[PDB]
């Protein structure tokens, strides 16, 4: 998975 800011 991916959390945050992109």
């Keep these: ?3 945050g800011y992109s």
């Design 1 to 3: 998975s991916y959390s």
